[PDB]
């Protein structure tokens, strides 16, 4: 409908229809969907991700890191009016905007070992604030990093603070990343701030020949 693939996979609150979608034959996306990234930013290698989708028929969503397990950070204030739910400020549903707690943002070290038999699609993000002030207000620590580790993946992201035009009211930016976690491999996150954490990931259950058809239409026929 009015959702984009990004909006769907990251879990735009305006995209609740697709919280748990069944197997599909092909995928239909409008040309310029309204519900994309509710909080402005970028989805790296997005096109390469749409391509992977088009070679896929079935995603089974699974909780990879429970929101409840964030004892020493705030997983409840990571919310924005740019991402409205039922009129109330909210955020992407499959991914968690961790914020400092008690004026402290302890270093995060979470690790997940894919024990499934399938490839698993994991999404995460980084927050790029407006100024050193906003930086301090959200995550106590002034200079931060996010490092992700895999058999094949190795990255360390540092938030790039700048003042940008307001898009949906927000002048900060969020940058999202993805990787495929192979069946006995593990993904290692270590961060001391600006981390947008995965909660839900996607098991690639059925790979097949499919497609993302760009169309404006929505027929109960076969």
């Amino acid at each position: 409908r009015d959702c984009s693939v990004a909006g769907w996979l990251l879990g735009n609150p305006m995209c609740d229809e697709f919280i748990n979608v069944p197997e599909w034959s092909y995928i239909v996306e409008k040309a310029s969907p309204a519900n994309d990234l509710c909080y402005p930013g970028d989805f790296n290698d997005y096109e390469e991700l749409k391509h992977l989708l088009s070679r896929t028929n079935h995603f089974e969503k699974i909780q990879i890191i429970p929101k409840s397990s964030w004892s020493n950070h705030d997983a409840s204030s990571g919310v924005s009016s740019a991402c409205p739910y039922h009129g109330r400020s909210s955020f992407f549903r499959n991914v968690v905007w961790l914020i400092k707690k008690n004026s402290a943002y302890p270093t995060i070290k979470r690790s997940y070992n894919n024990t499934n038999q399938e490839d698993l699609l994991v999404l995460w993000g980084i927050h790029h604030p407006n100024d050193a002030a906003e930086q301090t207000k959200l995550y106590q620590n002034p200079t931060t990093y996010i490092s992700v580790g895999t058999s094949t993946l190795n990255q360390r992201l540092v938030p790039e603070i700048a003042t940008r035009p307001k898009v949906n009211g927000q002048s900060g930016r969020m940058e999202f990343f993805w990787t495929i976690l192979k069946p006995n491999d593990a993904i290692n996150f270590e961060s001391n701030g600006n981390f947008i954490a995965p909660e839900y990931a996607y098991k690639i259950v059925k790979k097949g020949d499919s497609a993302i058809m760009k169309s404006e239409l929505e027929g109960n026929c076969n």
Partner: antibody
Amino acid sequence: EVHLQQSGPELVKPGASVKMSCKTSGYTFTEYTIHWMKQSHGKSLEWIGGIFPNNGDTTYNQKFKVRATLTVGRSSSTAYMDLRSLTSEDSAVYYCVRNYGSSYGYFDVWGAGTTVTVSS
Amino acid sequence: DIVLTQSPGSLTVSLGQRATISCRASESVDNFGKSFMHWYQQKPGQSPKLLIYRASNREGIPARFNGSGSGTDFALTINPVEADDVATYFCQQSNEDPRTFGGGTKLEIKR
């Protein structure tokens, strides 16, 4: 979300008629066929019928062809069913259900259940 | 009519074991190369729930549910059996109107 809010439990004198409603919400009414299922108290599920909102085409079971009547209020985003001249037979629960695609489709979102009681 | 007959009618299985419920179709429910069978779960006191579509693929459904079968007979396999699995399970075919359901199988937990 895909919520289907339906009518409240009802009582009908034998021989009378009921009209339970199902209110659609959260998706595009006009893209999917809505159907009705009858469940004889803790036994077996029976298919009643289907209706496609966008043009109002109906598809009935042999059994219910007569007694049943699916209708749709497009502005209302609401599907209705009507059971005429009831008996003890019809005392059971009725589910307003969204079926995914066409003649060869699965019922993915099931409503609460309007439960009908036929007694004098 | 494609008469669907589930077996057994009632099944009591020990906790942490394997429940194995069968379905048998009077005529095949199986063309286009796919099986048009579906499994449904009715936890007591509430409406039925969708488990498996076209006989093998899970709909937010835990892997403990193994949809299997082809043609005239199928099987829903629950293994390992958990606590919140008390329900009556239904198989229903879509291969050919009029849509027909199974008798249903009630599952009980031995504790």
